Amino acid sequence: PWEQTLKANDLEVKIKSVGNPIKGDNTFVLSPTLKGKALEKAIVRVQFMMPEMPGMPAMKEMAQVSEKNGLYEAKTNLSMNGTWQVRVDIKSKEGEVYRAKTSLDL
C-alpha cells in the first residue's frame, strides 16, 4: 500500500493509503508530528492536483479531512488514473504553518 513520509526539518508527515489507491473513492491517513510528537487539533488540508493534459482540464481535488487523536483521515475521489500532485498544508493548534508535497502515480 502506497505510503510516503514527508520531512521538513522538525515536521514529519507520514501519509499512507488505506488499502491500495484506486480510481474512485480513496482514503489516506496522515500522521503529522513535530519532533515526533503528534499535532492534535490541527488544520490539515490535502490537495490532489493533475495539471491540464490532452483531453482534460487541470483538476484539483481537496480532500475531506477528519481527525481522531492526531491521526487525520483524508477522503477524496480520484476520478482518473495518472500522476496526482499531493500538497499537504498544516496549521498547528499553536498557529504554526507547514507545507509538504509528494506525488501519487496512480
- Contact positions vs its own copies (CB under 8 A): 4, 50, 53-56, 80-83, 85-86, 101-103, 105-106
Cβ at position 8, least distance to Ag ion in Å: 19
Q: Which residue has the cell 490532489?
A: 48
Cβ at position 102, least distance to its own copies in Å: 4
Kindly tell me which of 37 and 101 has the beta carbon lying closer to its own copies. 101
For residues 99 and 44, give the distance between their C-alpha atoms in angstroms, rounded to a whole number: 10
Kindly tell me which of 18 and 80 has the beta carbon lying closer to its own copies. 80
Specify the amino acid at residue 33: T
For residues 40 and 20, give the distance between their C-alpha atoms in angstroms, rounded to a whole number: 26
Kindly tell me which of 66 and 83 has the beta carbon lying closer to its own copies. 83
* Chain centroid offset of residue 8 CA: 15
